[PDB]
Symmetry: D2
Subunit: 231 residues, 4 copies
């Protein structure tokens, strides 16, 4: 019966418990910038960042056949100079220890244009596989989400997000909420970890600006997470 | 900095920590029946039950001006012999210590046809003030909800529900989920406790069958809850 | 799998979640006075107070045979005008719902000079059954402790106390610590709840001044507690 | 306000969240062997192991001046073929990220015969600086403990240990308990982290067999730990 939890209400520059990738960095202001931006703070096209959590997570044990439940929360934001021309998006995810980045822009640095990753996307941009309108999605080893739901996204406003995975029912659930606007979104579906990730994994976020365009920055303010893996 | 939490995965007949009201009782089977039903288990019109939690909850302190945050979860179900003719509904709520029941049927035993109660309704029945289709609602000292959202309800299937109240932003958030169906609903809005309940309160559920008709039973399987009231 | 927890860092006058008995009251200053004292704050002989916690605790279930584990912490103090002439003591305890007080002075209001109570005593006074020097003791249905250990008590100084009961090993453990003095005491022994209390109980403290003399007041500053009762 | 916690009831061979050093390894049997032993399981003189926890711990922040509180628990054991001739001991500790081992035998791999380490020792062996009889000690940047207390140690029997550090009072407290024997030991003292470790640290255990002799193996069965570092 293994557990773990952590939580921060700010990010400390150069925390040794974290791992930055791509343009992803930790402002002194405490924010987690994953995207590169102008002196003017303008997001910079073809930008890319990821950020993982040092300790790896024992998602599930093969001996016991046990699968864990975890939940994670965090508040992110996005800045976008032209709310008409948006992209590319943000994700939270579970990968394996060795995970380096991947395709930028529409692949949210998670998938490859070509080719054991699970995640929740906050997609700003209508790709070919994307449905209409910024949505939220569950990605199971694929940028084409198993299920989606509009995301009543809102520029510059903060959003609290909560993600849960119930081993018992095998149900990832994600809800995003915008206190500023008193609006809210939720999504749910089954996901079989036992067959989509390694007995151990590392979690983190990923985020991408557009190619042709800047789109929107993506900074994360806080993160908490916990897991129980039963005997 | 006051806190409290409890949680049960079943109900024990005659738990001294609880309080039954109306037809509300605790089956040996461990369920929390709030409605009276046939030998055949058929809900029985004009039925009514409530069930409160012994210890009262210090929702907020006037000296300090502090307001608490709490969250509560629980899984309920409903049985309805004629999925066409449904009613009347279920609620979870915060009232003051002395709260006895009130109007039955459409008033979900919470309000009076006439006349400091806050709650979340899972309304099966279209009253006059009700919108169309079973919804979910936030009730603030009134059976006419401040905001609502369809409830993709489903007979006989179990639903996990989670309710949160963030003092900081003053935002009650409710999400109901039906793992069986992989569907999900969420609702959010601000609620000022400081002006809608007493420094201390008691929480519990309430549930009602129809007048003219039976409608649907309402049993609750589990309950967990916690609160922090800061210094 | 039933749980419960609460914690306060101060006492609120007239908390509806608590129960006072005897002279036990809640100063505005936030302290929990269990003993009556002078305008000068001088403890008043033959004084007596208890204070219980509203919600009852399901210590153990007969159907399942399950026994719970709990731990409790709290910081108390004692004021004693004549550190030479001390008494009578303080206790923390588990009794059954209906528990009213009992013998004063040396019986710490827990036992009767004559005659299902479990507790930990912080004895200031050498009774006949008492060993030498203020000690700490485990009382199992009897003022004559099953085991004891000196208590390097210290007037007017605050003491943090922690009590644990491990169902698995059936071991109550108590440790008292005096940060002020960087000193510390610990005691341990087995206790069979299953045969010394009711499936349900209520917990609280009890405290007594001397007969012939005042001895020492006993106020409690904070209290936290938790319990898991497994399936 | 940063926190973290983890806990395991067994050790998984080759957990990527841990770090072995010296002879320290993880038996398949789930135990954490820190010492090398015979095919017969006989401890092997001049043996040495340490084991650290992957994620580093932000013990305290210089900007804020904040210091954290943590507590840790774990159950260890020791096997010793000749209960007359014992050594060398075991420790739990906080060091800085880069910590590799150090002096063996009496230095419990923590200190150097010569020369920012804080720890609690379970010393089997009377060095020169050691007091009489296996004790427990608080080591602050030195194998000569700031304070000690006998350890009513017991061969082959399991011991539950609990360590707490209260930032507020700056008091490390350690209590060791032997349910098997219903005995118990406790130690307490102030320790200024702010001046004895780095803003960030890594924790783990260390353990040593004797030089001339085998003494006693040292395996650890379980570990839990948590920390809050306030804003
Ligand atoms: C999200 O977290 C940030 C940083 O911890 C905080 O300043 C902000 O107000 C938070 N927003 C919500 C909605 O909790
Ligand atoms: C809800 O709780 C009940 C009783 O604790 C349990 O048997 C049922 O499977 C639960 N359903 C979900 C979706 O967790
Ligand atoms: C004990 O609790 C009181 C009241 O909460 C506090 O003011 C006091 O400083 C505490 N002492 C210790 C040693 O924690
Ligand atoms: C200590 O932990 C081990 C492994 O988790 C367990 O098997 C053993 O019985 C425990 N002993 C105590 C006293 O809790
Ligand atoms: Ca896209
Ligand atoms: Ca209605
Ligand atoms: Ca006595
Ligand atoms: Ca030594
Ligand atoms: Mn998509
Ligand atoms: Mn309604
Ligand atoms: Mn005694
Ligand atoms: Mn020593």
């Amino acid at each position: 019966a293994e557990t773990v939890s952590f939580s921060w209400n700010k990010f400390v520059p150069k925390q040794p418990n974290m791992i930055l990738q791509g343009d992803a960095i930790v402002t002194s202001s405490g924010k987690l910038q994953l995207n590169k931006v102008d002196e003017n703070g303008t997001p910079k096209p073809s930008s890319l960042g990821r950020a993982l959590y040092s300790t790896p997570i024992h998602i599930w044990d093969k001996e016991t056949g046990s699968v864990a439940s975890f939940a994670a929360s965090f508040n992110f934001t996005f800045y976008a100079p032209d709310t008409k021309r948006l992209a590319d998006g943000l994700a939270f995810f579970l990968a394996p220890i060795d995970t380096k980045p991947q395709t930028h822009a529409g692949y949210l640095g998670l998938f490859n244009e070509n080719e054991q990753v699970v995640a929740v996307e906050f997609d700003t941009f209508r790709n070919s596989w994307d449905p209409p309108n910024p949505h939220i999605g569950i990605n199971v080893n694929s940028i084409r989400s198993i299920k989606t739901t509009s995301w009543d996204l809102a520029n510059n406003k903060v959003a609290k997000v909560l993600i849960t995975y119930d081993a018992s029912t095998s149900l990832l659930v994600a809800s995003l909420v915008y206190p500023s606007q008193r609006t809210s979104n939720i999504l749910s579906d089954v996901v079989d970890l036992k067959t989509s990730l390694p007995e151990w994994v590392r979690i983190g976020f990923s985020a991408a600006t557009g190619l042709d365009i800047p789109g929107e920055s993506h900074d994360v303010l806080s993160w908490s997470f916990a897991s129980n893996l039963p005997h």
